[PDB]
Amino acid sequence: LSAASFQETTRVLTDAAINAKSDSLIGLKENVIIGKLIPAGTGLSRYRNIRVEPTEEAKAAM
Amino acid sequence: QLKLHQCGLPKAMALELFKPFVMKRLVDLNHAQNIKSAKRMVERGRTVVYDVLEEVIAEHPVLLNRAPTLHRLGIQAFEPQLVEGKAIQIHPLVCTAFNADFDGDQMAVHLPLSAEAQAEARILMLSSNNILKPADGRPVTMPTQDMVLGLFFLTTDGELRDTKGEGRAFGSTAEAIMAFDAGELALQSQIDIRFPVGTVAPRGWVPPVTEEGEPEWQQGDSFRLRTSLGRALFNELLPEDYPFVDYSVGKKQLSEIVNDLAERYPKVIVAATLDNLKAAGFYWATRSG
């Protein structure tokens, strides 16, 4: 996908069709193309898997 | 007049971008009965619509951009405020980042919507957090023209200048300013000024005044320094803890000082100091001659 979107689309596509290559969507360009979160910055799974709750003291106060 | 984290939008553009928010808000305050009447009122441009717009627009960052975007400092988030006219107002300091001139350039404005987009535009991309350049680490948000000139005229030696005074001793900077108002003192003449306890002595400052049985502290001791009124006024712009500068400030020295400030101080203090330097530079560049 990235190679095709760079340049020489016809040659890249006809080379990938014969080999039956599979794209795993690990880069930035592919994720941008298909429209999901890029795997960098705030799009990583380290940061997005959390739980935000008030402290017991704060909830008790209000 | 803007701050380093502010921009000015024309009210037509602001009302067009923020149409749904304004409609919701003025249906919420009972200014309109439903969405249809609210949309009609917004489209026809009534009076209350702008009053509501000026409060829905608060604390909602907008991303400003100029093409070509050669590096990531070409997109930056600013807090918008309404202005009268049809042209966007931009802080003079950020121009070098955008490579923006005022000979007829144009810029584009985008509006984040979701909470994540606002958090990113407010924490990552804010304008007063991007002093340094990613290429080499030297500041780009720095006083460049008409401010370097003012700060150079303020802090420079009177080689061929008409230096009046040249031997007077003053008890404070206020007295020096009072003498300057009358035609008795020059901004570049050398005089002895006494400073209060708070000030920090210049780096170096090899002699703590020779004594016998009475020490001195690096801070909290009043000392007399022989300098010009211009340097005394320039040192009122820098933070309270910064050592006295006491030397002519071109553009290399200003870059060194700004880099030191960015390295050693928090971001709010650095932004405030940059605003102070900008204001003083313009003020003393007008009277530079």
């Binding site: - | 919420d28 305050l29 009972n30 200014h31 009965q33 209350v48």
Partner: protein, 214 residues
Amino acid sequence: MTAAVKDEISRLPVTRTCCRKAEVSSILRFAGGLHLVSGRIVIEAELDTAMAARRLKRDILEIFGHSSELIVMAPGGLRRGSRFVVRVVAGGDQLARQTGLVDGRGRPIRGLPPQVVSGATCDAEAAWRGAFLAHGSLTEPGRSSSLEVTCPGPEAALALVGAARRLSIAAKAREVRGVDRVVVRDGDAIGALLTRLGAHESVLAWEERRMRRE
């Protein structure tokens, strides 16, 4: 007699925005008025309850976005009844136009605002609650409470009767000596109405009092 009832009603928490708007409009219409002085319109609302004035001021500030003064000097002059008066001078015209008292760039609306009418049952009962807080009484002189609340002009009274009808609660408008009110006489309707308004302890006390005496 009614001080505890009005205290309980004032202390009742409220969440929905439309009901708060209806309550504010009702109280302003009944126990409020407008004055054109110094070329500007000022809204003055007189209440004789401790918490009700604070509640009205908070509602105005929250939903309508305005500031009030909350003076305690008695317009009556006795200063014993604690005749609280809440005032709105800044943006008074906007508040009057956006709360239903005046609409269409014309005369003040005699009845309740059209927004309050033809609304959900919650807004109808909120309007009745505001009307009771503003003016009203619970006499119980003889056999029935005579839960009478006075209104300015036949329009407000008959609008209150209509709102009460939507609650499946009987009511009757009446006029005497040039002043008109809405009253409900039978005990069952009184109890159901007071229960709907939100008061609980007063409702019980009235229930046991009526059952024991009758």
